[PDB]
A paper describes a structure:
In accordance, the structures of inactive mutant D394A, in which the catalytic acid/base D394 was substituted with alanine, and the structure of complexes with nigerose (D394A-Nig2), nigerotriose (D394A-Nig3), nigerotetraose (D394A-Nig4), and kojibiose (D394A-Koj2) were also determined. In the −1 subsite, the Glc−1 of all ligands (glucose, nigerose, nigerotriose, nigerotetraose, and kojibiose) are accommodated in the active site pocket in almost the same manner and recognized by surrounding residues via hydrogen bonds and hydrophobic interaction. In the D394A-Koj2 structure, the Glc+1 adopts the same chair 4C1 conformation as in the D394A-Nig2, but its sugar ring is overturned.
Furthermore, the three-dimensional structures of LlGH31_u1 determined using X-ray crystallography and cryogenic electron microscopy revealed that LlGH31_u1 forms a hexamer and has a C-terminal domain comprising four α-helices, suggesting that it contributes to hexamerization. Finally, crystal structures in complex with nigerooligosaccharides and kojibiose along with mutational analysis revealed the active site residues involved in substrate recognition in this enzyme. This study reports the first structure of a bacterial GH31 α-1,3-glucosidase and provides new insight into the substrate specificity of GH31 enzymes and the physiological functions of bacterial and fungal GH31_u1 members.
Author numbering:
A (entry chain A), B (entry chain A): 11 to 739
Write the structure that this text describes.
Amino acid sequence: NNNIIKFDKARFTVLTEHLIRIEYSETGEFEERMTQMVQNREFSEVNFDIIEKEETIEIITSTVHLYYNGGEFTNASLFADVKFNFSVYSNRWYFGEKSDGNLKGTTRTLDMIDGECPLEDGIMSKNGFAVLADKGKVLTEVGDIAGNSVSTIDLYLFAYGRDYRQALKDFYQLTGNTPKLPRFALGNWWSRYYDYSDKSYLALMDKFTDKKVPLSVSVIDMDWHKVSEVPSRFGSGWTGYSWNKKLFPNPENFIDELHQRKLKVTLNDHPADGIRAFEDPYPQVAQTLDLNTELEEAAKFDFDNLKFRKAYFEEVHGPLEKEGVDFWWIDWQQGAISKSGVDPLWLLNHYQYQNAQKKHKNNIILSRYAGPGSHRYPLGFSGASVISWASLDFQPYFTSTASNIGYTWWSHDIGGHMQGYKDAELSLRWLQFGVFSPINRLHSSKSEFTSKEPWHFDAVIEQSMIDFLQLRHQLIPYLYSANLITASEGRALVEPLYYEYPMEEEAYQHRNQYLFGEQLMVAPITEKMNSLLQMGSVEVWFPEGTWYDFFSGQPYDGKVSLKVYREITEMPVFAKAGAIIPLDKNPLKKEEIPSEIIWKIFPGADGEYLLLEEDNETKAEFVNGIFTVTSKKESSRKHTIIYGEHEIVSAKRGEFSIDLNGKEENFDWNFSTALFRRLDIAEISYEQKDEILQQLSLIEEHEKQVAFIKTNENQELQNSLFELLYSGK
Amino acid sequence: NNNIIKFDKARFTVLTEHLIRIEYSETGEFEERMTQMVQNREFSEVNFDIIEKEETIEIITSTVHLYYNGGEFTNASLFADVKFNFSVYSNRWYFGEKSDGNLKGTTRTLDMIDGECPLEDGIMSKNGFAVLADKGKVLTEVGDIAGNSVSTIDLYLFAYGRDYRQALKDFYQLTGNTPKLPRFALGNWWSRYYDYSDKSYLALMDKFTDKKVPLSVSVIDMDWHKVSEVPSRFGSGWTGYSWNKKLFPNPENFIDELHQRKLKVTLNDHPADGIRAFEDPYPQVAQTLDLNTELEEAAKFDFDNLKFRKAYFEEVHGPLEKEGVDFWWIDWQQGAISKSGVDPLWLLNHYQYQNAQKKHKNNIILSRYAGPGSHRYPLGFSGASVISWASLDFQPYFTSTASNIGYTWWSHDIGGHMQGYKDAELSLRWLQFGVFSPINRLHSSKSEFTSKEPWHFDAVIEQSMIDFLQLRHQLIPYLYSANLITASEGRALVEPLYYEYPMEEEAYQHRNQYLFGEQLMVAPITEKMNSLLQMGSVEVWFPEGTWYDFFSGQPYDGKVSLKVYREITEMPVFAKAGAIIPLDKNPLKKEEIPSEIIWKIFPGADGEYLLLEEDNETKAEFVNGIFTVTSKKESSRKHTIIYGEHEIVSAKRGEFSIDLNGKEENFDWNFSTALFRRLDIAEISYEQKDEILQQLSLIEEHEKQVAFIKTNENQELQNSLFELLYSGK
Ligand SMILES: OC[C@H]1O[C@H](O[C@@H]2[C@@H](O)[C@@H](O)O[C@H](CO)[C@H]2O)[C@H](O)[C@@H](O)[C@@H]1O
Ligand SMILES: OC[C@H]1O[C@H](O[C@@H]2[C@@H](O)[C@@H](O)O[C@H](CO)[C@H]2O)[C@H](O)[C@@H](O)[C@@H]1O
């Protein structure tokens, strides 16, 4: 209560030096209960100053002056100046007004979105402040909706300046941390809106195995249940809780077959038409909810109702879980209306996520975003994106920006959901992004033409998709370790560049560029290739330091902004000198944790990586060319070491140290080989190819090689050749 | 009161299985009085089911579940599920919310509209439900405004699925049927915003006669009254009730001359500036309304005021009716403001239509649309459209869609009203549409350059316009019979395709295509011709069955979507095998009812037509090749029979039967003649003409003729030649 101040009809709680709760109450009673958004207001004491007069109060922290002149909250009575100079005159917050600078957050869904859509604000601002209004209902101690807050205005003023990571950590302290995901969530998911049989689904899973594509999750979309078989008097077949017996004559046996293949199983649930009289569970639900069965009274969807929720979980979901369903895909698109005023999507995510923990430890849902704090109910499901280059070009930005409201587990339909147009290169670029996204779930529309199976495409596209799908499983150790860091430390897997580089203007000018964990920087290509180059491109900002392409070892001297070119089969992913990345050596092998880790080391600096696991922690240190691996607990795990180009240690057990000062630091990547390959694939004149190869071979001085390419009439070819010269400088 | 249910502060009236009145009352009193919209709530008893609990009620009909959870009406408390599967999740109505599917209705006016404008919703939805809010004032038993309803919310839930015609019939039962039009309303009207004299107007009417163009109505626009002669102290000359004596020195004599030519006469009335002190009727109105004549107090327009309305009808209109004015063109553009809150346009249409019945049986007005139920006051006047291809291309869609709110007598300015641009082909296409529209009124702006006289144009355009104007009068029997069917059975003359073909997707994809009565299907051409073809075109959907061009006999096998091409002088109008269409044999002859009917029969199927008239009903039956004509009452009428190509019976009196099994079924239309004509008019290379004529003559197999035209480099020429091959298959 030292950090609590009352003045007129207002209450101010100084939670941190940079976070102030602001309340109004007509009744002089203020709200202590949790809300849909806020789970915890216990924060360590902080120092601040007050100037309290007859008519006014000023609260002063290290970063903000908050002023209240009494009366009802207006833009004139309640306002704040930040103690920063990030702008010339955008340093003042006025109650109920917008200011410039917000770096945005996320939105409910990408349903029906072709390219960009507007986002809600987040808690991050280039000008150093943000206000997060709490407009939600209060909860009970066990987490049911209690009704309206007695704080009829309840706001959180964030004044973290450009300390974005601390703003997000303290947001997680206020709204609750993200829970740990289970390891299975981080592998490849298969999904398709397609009327598979038990037989054709298992045949497809076995084809994945034959094709060397690993999967963690088998999604079964809505054709699992009755659709066309629903009498039209009941409405549509969109909602269903009854297996189609022609396609799934023995559901538990089919789910047992997926479980024997080490797949987790989820079903699509369209909840909005509730439980109607044709459904297999209807007789039990009708008994529980005292429905008029002779008038075929439906159990209408009503998540405000405790008895409805219990019948839904116990008598509708329950029998399907007993057949082996592992977790629920909540696919809600029917609006925000309820008698309580609570969004039905929030009620579903909150209650289903809680219910999911009963049968499985660290279980998930798959559902759309339900507003600030809904990160407590992973995973995010963005929905029915339009299949286009424009949609892909929006999606990396969308994903990293979501970290600004703490929603760090978006699962996008990889390759896009529906409508749009066919382009196998779009499908391949989208999968590249997906593999370097929070979740890699392949999914598609009801079209006969939109399957994301790699072997849908030509041999080049197929092989590249298989390679990227294998890479996702190689990355599960790195992903699972980052997941435990999200849960315990409040750090997002995917960060916008400005989290690490808040004072670099270029960190705000590369919307689709992001940090992926702590060791990798990703610049997805999201534009159709230039046919004259047979390469796509993206402008990359390289921070200070020496950077390596993660795949090729091509080097780049930061700090620089440089257009980079890749063939459709290659993705721009970069690691600094000293980076250490663990990889599963056996990504196809079905085993709860890897029996073998590859330690991939980028030479040129010291580094360190901590591999967090279910039942271990393993530290890899690279210090003055000595690489050491230690673990809390011992195991039979075999460690492989790759130092730049070369495997140094194969399948060594236990803790150890090896000196790498003696070993070759340099990657094989060389200017001449890369130049020949770019000229060779280009759809340009052979005379141009001959002249460029000859002149760049003959001209010795780097500055004169650049002058030569500066004369080229092909402006994009100049930029491609300039990237090679910059790396070879 | 079995079909009436009260619950909390609500009342539900189950009017049909598919129509429910929904009311809220704070006072517990509910509204029994008629409203501006609703004239009748007497409906036959229907069966339905109720589930009534302590806190909730559910009403169940054959097609809808209506739910009310008590309290004030909100999107959460009042909602409905339809018992249809036309959509996957657009089958729920929420109070105060919009859903997808509405097929739209109409709007007040096309004043200042160049092309499309937004329309209001109608009662028709592809998803099977619509809500019609009653926001109007209550009426007295005699039809004066009584004030505010005691049902402060009063809604009609329509749940007819895709039974659009029954929805419209029951809408007419609720809001009152359309009245019968008089026969004169269905002929050609002449109108022009032009300062004619008595002499020049009669000279123009006599020129129509000399030119073989029949007219039913002589409109006199606002230059009938003082305009420039109004002193500026009184405001403008827009409103006027005083003849310009220079132009009309003897009005009654001039109107007697129009009456001797068998014309009905209407004057433009701009009511909004009321009756000012310069007007001829002002001294009488001033006496009646106790105005201060020495301060020249105006009788301001006030249709809320009983004494104003009586002075307007009796002392302003009355003297002009005594001079011979037959009906009123109410031309109101001055807004929706009144102290009552009732739109002055509604007050004008309601009261003027009632007043018009005093001197003439089944009299009309001509006025803009005044909201749902204003079909009770025909005719609709769409107003000041911009003269453009875009305006014409909107107008068929506009006209058929208006049937969805029961407003089936739109009169458009044929050829467009004002601004826009000159194109004699646009004028001709617009007249083609007009002739196949509810009303065929030629009208134009104050421009010296926008007259719709046929002889304004070149000899080709003039002759075609004269032919279409004669065709309108040939169609009056068919129109008048359809008019009596609108009045008695609630069936629109102009129907969207989806009224007849609700489950055919193509019936929703041909916006400008419509049924015209029960025997004809119209696809107006509303795009400028392709100069290379010298033909315009429209994509026609042909339903199942055998169809014939009404003019040429060109055949088409349904079901198919086919681009059809016509010269600027020809319009796509189609009749099914078995169609029977009556035509006036003597459209120029002035006679109250035709002394001679042509029965035009399309061979290939049975058919039937009922000709409703003022004092008769005549049935034409075509059954197993036997054509029979019978009538309720006998007459001297002479019947002509045309069976396909050939006149079989000329001028036969009385009831009779003739066997047509022996007679030639086939039209003359043939592929070779039509091919030669299309190639001959085309502005293409003579070498192409020669090759196409030669190859299509030489190649015998239909499939190889199509393959030949498929190679043509002119893509539109392919489609034109494909139409001929499809008809000749
Ligand atoms: O469960 C089937 C899919 O439903 C939702 O997407 C639908 C989409 O595939 C298509 O049918 O259009 C409708 C209307 O826009 C969508 O609701 C889910 O978003 C999707 O993931 C499912 O596969
Ligand atoms: O009575 C004359 C015409 O008045 C209305 O149209 C006017 C139009 O012709 C022009 O003068 O522009 C004004 C302003 O937009 C319009 O009010 C009627 O719509 C028209 O039918 C009359 O001929």
